[PDB]
Structure formats: structure tokens, C-alpha cells
Amino acid sequence: NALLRYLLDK
Amino acid sequence: ENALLRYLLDK
Amino acid sequence: ASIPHLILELLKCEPDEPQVQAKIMAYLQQEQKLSTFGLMCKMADQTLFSIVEWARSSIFFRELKVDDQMKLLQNCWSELLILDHIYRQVVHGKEGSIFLVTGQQVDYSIIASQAGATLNNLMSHAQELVAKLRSLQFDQREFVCLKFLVLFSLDVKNLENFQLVEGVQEQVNAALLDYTMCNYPQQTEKFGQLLLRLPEIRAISMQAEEYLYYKHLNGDVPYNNLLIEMLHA
Ligand SMILES: CCCCCC/C=C\CCCCCCCC(=O)O[C@H](COC(=O)CCCCCCCCCCCCCCC)COP(=O)([O-])OC[C@H](O)COP(=O)([O-])OC[C@@H](O)CO
């Protein structure tokens, strides 16, 4: 969810 | 003892 | 540079970083209602698969019986993860940003605000270690040597072939002693600054296991893996 999405988006 | 470690060291 | 022949052979064992990186990213996307700390345990776990793979096809390690191989890795798994993490911060790390094994840069700000006491003590000891190595222009030749000195330890008991282990200690130490002499001649201290970093890596990694075990007993480390099995003895 939160952390994993943050990693992909930048 | 460590079934997973052994598996990874054999194949 | 000028790289003693043994170091050239140890360098050939280094896996393609980019493939490990996207392998671990793809796997985490598959595991998909996951929590932050649980996600990182899975990232560390898969990194450990990657470490065992590297050791398994390494020069002198491939010659050991499986029981010797396990004894050595049960002794140094967490040190190898720390060294791996620390060397990633020297090369790819920038100002206030932990570089992950998956390729991204999480800002240290994010960790500071959400981390408790134990993890703050650990992250900070790790950062002073990174900065010591940063100022030594720590490079890949020196790194792969430190990895083999950590892997082929002399503090391990019950080894069927303690002679081969002692032999690679001897040869890797002498190869590193050689590389610092040729490449960094007027920096006499270099060799010793690298060896004194080993006790510190051992200590950060014992602390990390104690932290990871605390989290496991609190029910935060999702159901069992390579990391908890190593942690179990
Ligand atoms: C660099 C070495 C340090 C890391 C060691 C990690 C060990 C094993 C692998 C697990 C990876 C964990 C990832 C980082 C943790 C995390 O997700 O952060 C979470 C917060 O969100 C975040 O910080 C999200 C950002 C995550 C950044 C990852 C950075 C680590 C890089 C990977 C390391 C690889 C090498 C590993 C080698 C083994 C949770 O933090 P916390 O609440 O668990 O904080 C700990 C707390 O201090 C424990 O409780 P206490 O001591 O406060 O309670 C007692 C008190 O009453 C008295 O003091």
C-alpha cells in the first residue's frame, strides 16, 4: 500500500 | 536445523 | 587501478545488481493488506536469498560440504546484509536518503519521524559507519575483500575443513594488504581503517538481530522466512 506505491512513483 | 538454508545451498 | 589476481576472481562472483533489484521489486508487487515494516522484512528476506546465491557459486565456498557452508552463513548472514546495505549507501547514497536494494531513494526524513528508539540507535550507528567508509573512498575491490573476510570467519566451530577457511582468510587479507599498498601508497592507514570497520559491522548486525527478534516476538514480522530461520539459531 503506502510505502510500495511511494517507491514505484519515483 | 535449517531446512530452507540447506535447500538453497543444494538446488 | 591494479588489482591482485585473487581480487579479480572475487570480483567475478558479484551478481548483476539490476536483475536482483527488479526481481525483488516484482516479488513485492505480487505480495500486494501489508504493513510498512512487514514489506521491508520481505525485502530483506529476498536480499538474503540473493546473498546465499552469491556465496554458493563463490570460489572457495563452492568447495565446502553443505554443512560447512551452513555453519559459515549462520554466523555471518546479518553482517553480509549490513555490509551489502552500507556499500549501497557509499556508491548510490546521497544527502539524507537511504538507497534501497530495489533501487529507490527513501528520504531519511521519512524514517526519522516514524522510527522508535531501538531502530533510531541502529539507523544512526549505521550512518556513522557509512560516513566513515565514505571518507575512506571505499571501493568495490575493498568491499569484496571485506565480504570474504566476514564469510570465511575464524570464530566458527565444528568445521570439517577449518584448513580451507583459515587459508582464504590468509590469502584475502594478504590480497587486500597488497591492493592498498599499490593503489593507495601514500595512504598507509587505509588497510587498517578497512579492517577496524569489521568489529563495527559485527556489532551493528548483532544489534539488528536483537531488534528483528524483538519485532518478531511483538508479532510484526509476517509468517516466517529465511530471515527468521537464520534468526532461530
Ligand atoms: C541499517 C541497519 C538497521 C536496520 C536493521 C533491520 C533488520 C532486519 C530487517 C528488517 C528491515 C526493517 C526496516 C526498517 C524498519 C521499519 O520498517 O520502520 C518502520 C517505520 O517506518 C519507516 O521507517 C519506513 C521507511 C523504511 C526505511 C528502510 C531503511 C532500512 C533499509 C533496509 C536495511 C537492510 C539491512 C538489514 C540488515 C538486517 C517501523 O519502525 P519501528 O516502529 O519498528 O521502530 C523500532 C522501535 O525502536 C522498536 O521499539 P522500541 O525500541 O521503541 O520499544 C522499546 C522502548 O519502550 C524502549 O526503547
Side-chain angles (χ1 to χ4, degrees), chain C:
Chain C
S2 66
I3 309 155
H5 187 218
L6 181 59
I7 297 186
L8 287 177
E9 302 282 17
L10 309 175
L11 279 162
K12 287 180 197 221
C13 305
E14 290 293 292
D16 209 49
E17 261 188 9
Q19 277 171 359
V20 174
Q21 191 170 111
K23 173 260 290 194
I24 292 160
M25 199 63 222
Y27 160 79
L28 285 161
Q29 286 181 261
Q30 200 90 97
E31 288 252 13
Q32 279 151 85
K33 314 196 126 176
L34 242 191
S35 98
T36 309
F37 173 80
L39 187 100
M40 295 279 96
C41 286
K42 293 185 179 298
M43 177 181 299
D45 169 64
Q46 280 291 303
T47 306
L48 201 43
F49 275 66
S50 162
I51 291 194
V52 174
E53 193 176 19
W54 154 83
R56 198 190 156 210
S57 52
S58 296
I59 300 111
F60 309 97
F61 199 82
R62 77 220 297 184
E63 275 144 71
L64 289 165
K65 287 235 185 95
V66 174
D67 293 314
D68 279 358
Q69 286 182 333
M70 289 169 69
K71 286 169 194 138
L72 289 190
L73 281 162
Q74 283 164 307
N75 180 59
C76 83
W77 62 276
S78 57
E79 292 182 282
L80 285 182
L81 280 170
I82 289 304
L83 193 38
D84 184 68
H85 166 244
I86 263 56
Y87 176 74
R88 232 195 319 283
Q89 310 316 291
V90 177
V91 175
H92 299 115
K94 310 211 87 211
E95 165 92 289
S97 57
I98 305 307
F99 195 93
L100 291 179
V101 71
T102 47
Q104 305 83 38
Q105 284 207 139
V106 308
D107 301 13
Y108 173 80
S109 335
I110 285 134
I111 318 173
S113 58
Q114 228 128 66
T118 305
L119 174 66
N120 254 293
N121 287 311
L122 270 167
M123 259 279 114
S124 82
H125 298 163
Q127 232 60 50
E128 305 304 303
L129 208 215
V130 167
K132 220 129 277 137
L133 257 12
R134 214 123 72 190
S135 57
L136 273 24
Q137 292 94 293
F138 191 45
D139 63 38
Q140 199 186 26
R141 280 65 53 166
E142 296 161 7
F143 160 75
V144 171
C145 281
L146 286 214
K147 273 213 283 206
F148 273 83
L149 292 172
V150 166
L151 183 55
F152 288 95
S153 179
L154 305 179
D155 308 308
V156 184
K157 316 293 163 236
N158 316 314
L159 286 160
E160 197 231 349
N161 192 8
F162 197 69
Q163 171 152 258
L164 181 58
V165 177
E166 140 93 17
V168 176
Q169 256 291 322
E170 149 192 48
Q171 222 181 345
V172 174
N173 173 100
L176 183 76
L177 187 48
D178 202 283
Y179 169 91
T180 53
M181 194 221 118
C182 299
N183 284 274
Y184 304 103
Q186 55 254 301
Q187 272 117 26
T188 315
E189 74 266 316
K190 277 263 161 118
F191 171 80
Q193 301 198 100
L194 299 162
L195 294 188
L196 289 161
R197 245 90 305 266
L198 282 177
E200 297 176 340
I201 278 160
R202 170 45 112 216
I204 288 167
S205 73
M206 297 304 99
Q207 285 156 38
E209 284 177 42
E210 285 174 41
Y211 163 76
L212 204 274
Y213 218 135
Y214 158 79
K215 296 291 284 185
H216 166 63
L217 293 174
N218 205 33
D220 293 332
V221 190
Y223 185 25
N224 285 43
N225 20 265
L226 181 53
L227 224 135
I228 248 68
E229 201 187 88
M230 302 309 303
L231 200 77
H232 269 338

